[PDB]
Amino acid sequence: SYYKGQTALHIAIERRNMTLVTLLVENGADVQAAANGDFFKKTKGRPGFYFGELPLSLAACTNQLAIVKFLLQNSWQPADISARDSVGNTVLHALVEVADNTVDNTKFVTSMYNEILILGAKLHPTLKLEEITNRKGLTPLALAASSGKIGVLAYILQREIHEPECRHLSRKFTEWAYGPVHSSLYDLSCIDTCEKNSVLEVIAYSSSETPNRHDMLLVEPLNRLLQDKWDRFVKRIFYFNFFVYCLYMIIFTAAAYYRPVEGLPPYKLKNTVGDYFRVTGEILSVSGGVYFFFRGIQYFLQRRPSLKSLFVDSYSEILFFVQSLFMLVSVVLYFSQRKEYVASMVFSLAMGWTNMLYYTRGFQQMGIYAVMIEKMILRDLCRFMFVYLVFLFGFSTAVVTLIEDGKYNSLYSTCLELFKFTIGMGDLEFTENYDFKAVFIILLLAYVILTYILLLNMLIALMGETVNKIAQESKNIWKLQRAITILDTEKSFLKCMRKAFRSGKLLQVGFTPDGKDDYRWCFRVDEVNWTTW
Amino acid sequence: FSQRKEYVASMVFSLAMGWTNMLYYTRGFQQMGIYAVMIEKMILRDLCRFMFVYLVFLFGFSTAVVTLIEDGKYNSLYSTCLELFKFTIGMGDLEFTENYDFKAVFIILLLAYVILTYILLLNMLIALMGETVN
Amino acid sequence: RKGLTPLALAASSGKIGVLAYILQREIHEPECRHLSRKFTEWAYGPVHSSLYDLSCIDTCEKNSVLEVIAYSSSETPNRHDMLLVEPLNRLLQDKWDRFVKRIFYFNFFVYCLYMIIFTAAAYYRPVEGLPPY
Ligand code: NA
Structure with a gap:
């Protein structure tokens, strides 16, 4: 089951013997054999080498250029390009999937991609390869975007071909040039609206484990x-x-x-203006609360994210939902003739007032500040409160056990008294009903020294991480947040109107291999070059 | 079992030390273990080098201040040492006694002590981060 | 006399280079393969799996490399x-x-x-x- 399905053609291809491959091909063996052995599975056991399951893909992904040309240019039985394996991946999909973000690997992959694409265009100009999709409905571009392959995406987005009968395969063009200045054009087809899944949509909603979202x-x-x-x-x-x-x-x-x-x-309200105004305000508050509740539940229904991403992602959608829950519980208690609605209302009010940092995005410096704040909250609170709480509890229990009787013979009182030391209100003589004053003094001094050492260590460790490697990440995170906001706002059309659209219609290539012309929704950019003439 | 009362003191020392002795189990978790390693390194590498000067200053100025006073509740050494230690945790008084002569000397001594101690703390936190060049 | 082999002696005294060379020694000559410690079970395309010899590393019955490195005194140069x-x-x-x-x-x-x-x-x-x- 592990080596099952292998065929002689695969060995011939992967031994680098052109003559043996040719001689074996001369026999007439089928060139569409597929190996279903577990050794070629995706992630079933750490060992394995996924290569597309087809001999053509095997040749493509193993530095073989002359061999692949020979396979594709034989008069006996040329191998079809539109072949799909059990998973549905094509040679292009396999090429995309093999990449692992290394400079030599990236240049190899892009060169092979360009060569195979131009050969395919030359042999069968009528057909187009980039629009063939696997079972998951992912094209090579979408697959590259989803899995975080920077090199392949960068190469594909700004692809340039400078050969006759191959211009129509390009995505970047040049409308005109004059002296040190020339203006380029970029193709926006299937980038912001493809009707199935765009590049921007895939990048925006990807889960956090993806390598290179930012x-x-x-x-x-x-x-x-x-x-x-x-x-x-x-x-x-x-x-x-x-x-x-x-x-x-x-x-x-x-x-x-x-x-x-x-x-x-x-x-019971009274016949005066103040009562009417107060009732109106309360009604407005309840309406806002229910609105936020419904919006939050709708979002949680549509997205349906995992568990570990509920705090790394959606860090604000949970807070708004919690505020709404507090408001609704407050209303329920209020109409039940109780008095805890006040507590619920104050919690809701404080949380809502502090929930206003969400709008600092849209301003650069404030957004970066807020990003640093949230990163520190999520990255230091747990790691730095554990030790402090341990120390506090231990010394509080000791001190309480020492005391005989009085007002400070509880645990809450002594914990509060020892917490006062951290904010500049230590007493050192807050009680006198006990024995062995030396023990009392020694315990208090040891606690103070340990706590101050701990605070010093916390602020040194906190700046250690910033070797200047904290701002460049913050800016990227802020940009991603703003991009998500833009996408959401665009999806939720303002009122019933609809005016947004990428850019203007334009004619750039003139004519395809067929007589008919074409339009491709370009987006012009002006740039000035002085050197490298 | 010897019919005494110091077993309470021994028990409280043991209890506090045992509760604080729980950082040993932070190894087995990466980030917590690194945090504990830094803590112990700092304890073993800065306490001796940074308490000597502070204790010297405290004792010298406490002896001077006690010698200045005539009589009262603060005419001991323990009381004045505690009063001058209070300044470091944010509870300085600057008027904790009034039975003496030459108020100007008293004020000058207290101000000099405060300034020197704060300079010393500043120097300690700058020297402590200097070693971390990453 | 101290019951130390060249490998144990290298480990005890903190000689990084000698230990690193000895642990992953590779010989590519006929009639000398049996002196090697690192081998190659098989290779296929861009992937190949190696093997490492663990004899006298974690249990030698007198003193292993791990035991010597773990219990060494602090004055040794390169314990960490x-x-x-x-x-x-x-x-x-x-x-x-x-x-x-x-x-x-x-x-x-x-x-x-x-x-x-x-x-x-x-x-x-x-x-x-x-x-x-
Ligand atoms: Na204070």
């Missing part, structure tokens, strides 16, 4: 495209949303500040 | 950096992940339970005078 948006066209969309309309949409949220929060605060103090709600 | 050699890191990771993890977790749980019991017992001591009670 750094994959630095490729040329994407940055400018996102900036254009933003500056056209996302700015106005975002500012309107921010204003509305601020107004709602102000109303909620003002309504909560004037609650009545009589006992056992509900309270 | 001598475990970065190839086979040793993976060997230690394997042993850990097989069974030391479970042993360690059980020990941690037992210690926590004992400490909780001791704290609770000490918190409720009687206050009458002149023990025993």
Whole structure:
């Protein structure tokens, strides 16, 4: 089962013997044999070499150029290119999947890709390879984007061919040049809207374990495209949303500040303006709470993410949902003739007020500041509170055990007294009912020294990580966050209107191999070159 | 079992030390283990080199201040040492006694002590990060 | 006389280069393969699997390399950096992940339970005078 399915053609190909391969081919053996052995499986056991399951793919992925040309250019029985294996991957898909982000590997892969593509175009110009999809509905470009292959994506996006009868395979062109300045064009077909899955959509919604989510948006066209969309309309949409949220929060605060103090709600309103205003404010607050609840549940339903990504990703959708839950529980308690609705309301109010850092994205420096804040919260709280809590509990138990009786004979009181030392209110003489004063003093001094050493170690370790390798990541994270916001806003059409669109229609190549012309929704960029004439 | 009362002191020392003796199990977790390693290295490499100067300064200024005072509650050495130690944790008084002469000398001594101690703490935290060049 | 072989002597005195060379020695000549310690079971395309000899590394019945490196005194030059050699890191990771993890977790749980019991017992001591009670 492990070596099952192998055929002589595979050995001949993978031994680097051209003459033996030719002699074996002369016999007439089938060139469409597929090996289903477990040794060629995806990740079934660490050992294995996936190569597409076809002899043509084997030749392509093993540095074989003359051999693959011979296989594809024989008069006896040429091998079809549109072949698909059990998984459905083609030679192009296998080439994409073999890449592992190494400079030599990247140059090899791109050279082989270009050669095979031009040969395929030359032999059968009528057919197009890049639009063939496997079972998962992924094209080579989508597959490259999903798995974080920087080199292949970068090569494909700005591909340039400078040969007659092959211009129509290119994606980057040159509209005109004059002196030190020339303007280029980039093809946007299947980048922002493909009707199945675009590059931007795949990169934005990918799970966090993907290798290079942050750094994959630095490729040329994407940055400018996102900036254009933003500056056209996302700015106005975002500012309107921010204003509305601020107004709602102000109303909620003002309504909560004037609650009545009589006992056992509900309270019967009186014939005065203040009562009407207060009731209106409360109604508005409840409406906002239910709105946020429904939006959050809708998002959680559509995305359906995993568990480990619920805090690394969606770090804000959970907070808004929790605030809404607090509001609803407060309402339920209020209409049940109890008094804990006040506690629920204050928790909701504080959390909502602190939940306003979400809107700092859209401003560069503030966004970077917020990114650093959240990274530190998620990366240091757990690692630095454990030791402190251990020390506090141990010394508090010792001190409480020493005392005989009095007001400080509990555990809560002594824990609070020892916590006071960390914020600059230590007493050192907060009780006198005990024996062996020397033990008391020694314990307190040891606790103080250990805590201060611990704080010093925490601030040195915290700056150690920043070797200047903290800002370049923060900027990329902020850019990814803004990109997600732009995509979401575009998907949620403003009102019922629809004006957004990538760029203008244009004629660049003129004519395909067929007589008919074509249009490909380009996006012009102006650049000035002084050297390398 | 000898009908005494110091077993309480022994028991509390044992309890506190045992509770703090639990950092041994942080090995087996990568980041926590590295944190504990840094903690122990700092304890063994800075305590002796940084407490000597502070204790010297504290004792000298405490002896001077005690010698200045005439009589009262703060006419001992333990009391004045504790009062001057309070300054380091944010509870300085600057007027904790009034039974003496030559108030200017008292104020000058206290100000000099405060300035020297703060300079010393600053130097300690700069020297401590200097060693970490990554 | 001290019962040290060249490998043990190299490990004890902190000679990184000699130890690194000896551990992964490779000979590619006929009639001399049996002197090697690293081999090649098979190769296929861009992938090939190697083998490492573990005789007298983790159990020699007198003194192994791991035992000598672990218990060496602190004045030895390169105790910390001598475990970065190839086979040793993976060997230690394997042993850990097989069974030391479970042993360690059980020990941690037992210690926590004992400490909780001791704290609770000490918190409720009687206050009458002149023990025993
Ligand atoms: Na203070």
